[PDB]
């Protein structure tokens, strides 16, 4: 709980001012455990207090988490998913496909996000990824 | 289509959580190394003097 | 933590000045624990740009300017990881050497080989890192 | 209505191409409601004779060549019959299934059985086809 989250906050305070930039709200939620939308963050970054704020303290954030807890908890439920990219049912997809799914589809990610992600993803010498293992690793927590 | 884009969007959220946590774990590993290296260098100089 | 007597043990010649590269060892002789990075930042935020040596007044002004960051390095008494996640309490000598010689402000292999003298190692090849951190500091 | 993002949802191999047989689904994922016949005519008027897959450039050229016929397939908003001549506003479930599964580009019975789930049927055995056409499109 709060002891590791406070250390996570103290690694997001860089300056040491007790407060972190309001822009880094989504990354701090993600660091603790959650997986919220950038929209969901916008819908709860707004306030009259934190909308006006340039930086947020750990008491403020703890208050925001308490208010939005149910919605915030809802974004750790998923553990299963389906894709495609394999039609033949190999169970494997290329790194090229995975990049195309992530950067051209849905809520498009950047290449730098995908490159950051393939530092914690098993990739064989062929250049393919077992997507059943990959879904287990990304939900692993 | 509006159902299957909502498998891509959800995974895109979980990957954004995964990368941030991984980035944090790596920074904690580098910070843990710097502090101990430092404790050693403060101690090693003081002993000799 | 300024100490004129400690400065007079770094000054050997009695010139009144010590080399700008002995700044990290003088801070650490005193009691402080600054990173090699923090030491460079402290020098770089003064136009000691061309300065080959520092006097005790200059060193005093730098410690007073940076007292808060420098004091922080002598708060800590315990040290966690983040290497172990299983919570076995054990880390391989390979991972311990890697964090020391490959991450951060790297130690030399000869420095690490000194710290693993008299350090027990099991048949898995792992060391109790709690005992190892205590044995390094508590000496 | 070209969309590279939509192509990339159907390129599932990052290969750059999609199977020629997924051309009708890609048009109907973009917007466009083409017949299976119009789709075959569009493929057949190119020497894509031996082509197993299509790239986004090829698909772009076909939509530009046939833009007028394809655009016509998102003008419509209302749909009359030519069953019903009495003008009762009703059609039997038997006639409705026959027009869907026997005429034209035939739906399967399983697709028709899906469409008549929840759809009210009177004691004559007739369905309000205006409500039924609104329910299948407005959703």
Curated annotation (Swiss-Prot), chain B:
Q: What does this protein do?
A: Processive actin-based motor that can move in large steps approximating the 36-nm pseudo-repeat of the actin filament. Can hydrolyze ATP in the presence of actin, which is essential for its function as a motor protein. Involved in melanosome transport. Also mediates the transport of vesicles to the plasma membrane. May also be required for some polarization process involved in dendrite formation.
Q: Which family does it belong to?
A: Belongs to the TRAFAC class myosin-kinesin ATPase superfamily. Myosin family.
Q: Where in the cell is it found?
A: Golgi apparatus membrane
Instruction: Please state every residue range assigned to the domain named IQ.
Output: 4-28, 29-49
Measured against the full-length protein, the chain present covers 787 to 835 of 1829
Q: What is this protein called?
A: Unconventional myosin-Va
Summed up, the tissue specificity of this protein is: Neuronal and non-neuronal cells of the brain.
Self-association and partners: May be a homodimer, which associates with multiple calmodulin or myosin light chains.
From Swiss-Prot, chains C, D:
> What positions does the entry give for Ca(2+) 1 binding?
11, 13, 15, 17, 22
Modified positions (Phosphothreonine) in chain numbering: 35, 101
> Where, per the database record, does this protein carry N6,N6,N6-trimethyllysine?
106
Q: Where is this cross-link: Glycyl lysine isopeptide (Lys-Gly) (interchain with G-Cter in SUMO2)?
A: 12
Q: Which residues bind Ca(2+) 2?
A: 47, 49, 51, 53, 58
Q: Name one GO molecular function term.
A: type 3 metabotropic glutamate receptor binding
Which Gene3D superfamilies does this chain map to?
EF-hand
Pfam families reported in the protein's UniProt record: EF-hand_7
> Which is one Gene Ontology cellular component term of this protein?
cytosol
Residue numbers spanned by region Necessary and sufficient for interaction with PCP4: 67-139
Q: Which SMART domains match?
A: EFh
> So which domain of life are we looking at?
Eukaryota
Q: Could you tell me at which residue positions the Glycyl lysine isopeptide (Lys-Gly) (interchain with G-Cter in ubiquitin) crosslink is annotated in this chain?
A: 12
- Modified positions (Phosphotyrosine) are 90, 129
Residues bearing the modification N6-acetyllysine:
12, 85
Q: What does this protein do?
A: Calmodulin acts as part of a calcium signal transduction pathway by mediating the control of a large number of enzymes, ion channels, aquaporins and other proteins through calcium-binding. Calcium-binding is required for the activation of calmodulin. Among the enzymes to be stimulated by the calmodulin-calcium complex are a number of protein kinases, such as myosin light-chain kinases and calmodulin-dependent protein kinase type II (CaMK2), and phosphatases.
Family under the similarity heading? Belongs to the calmodulin family.
Subunit organization? Homotetramer. Interacts with CEP97, CCP110, MYO1C, TTN/titin and SRY. Interacts with MYO10. Interacts with RRAD. Interacts with USP6; the interaction is calcium dependent. Interacts with CDK5RAP2. Interacts with SCN5A. Interacts with FCHO1. Interacts with MIP in a 1:2 stoichiometry; the interaction with the cytoplasmic domains from two MIP subunits promotes MIP water channel closure. Interacts with ORAI1; this may play a role in the regulation of ORAI1-mediated calcium transport. Interacts with RYR1. Interacts with MYO5A. Interacts with IQCF1. Interacts with SYT7.
State the protein's name.
Calmodulin-1
Source organism: Mus musculus
């Amino acid at each position: 709980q709060i002891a590791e989250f406070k250390e996570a906050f103290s690694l997001f305070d860089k300056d040491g001012d007790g407060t972190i930039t309001t822009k880094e709200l989504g990354t701090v939620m993600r660091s603790l455990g959650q997986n919220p939308t950038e929209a969901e963050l916008q819908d709860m970054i707004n306030e009259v207090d934190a909308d006006g704020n340039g930086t947020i303290d750990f008491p403020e954030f703890l208050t925001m988490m308490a208010r939005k807890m149910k919605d915030t908890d809802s974004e750790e439920e998923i553990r299963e998913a389906f894709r495609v990219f394999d039609k033949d049912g190999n169970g494997y997809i290329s790194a090229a496909e995975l990049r195309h799914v992530m950067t051209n589809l849905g809520e498009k990610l950047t290449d730098e996000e995908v490159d950051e992600m393939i530092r914690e993803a098993d990739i064989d010498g062929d250049g393919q990824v077992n997507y059943e293992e990959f879904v287990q690793m990304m939900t692993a927590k | 289509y509006m159902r299957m884009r909502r498998a891509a969007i959800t995974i895109q959220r979980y990957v954004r959580g995964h990368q941030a946590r991984c980035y944090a774990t790596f920074l904690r590993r580098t910070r843990a190394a710097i502090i101990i290296q430092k404790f050693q260098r403060m101690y090693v100089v003081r002993k000799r003097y």
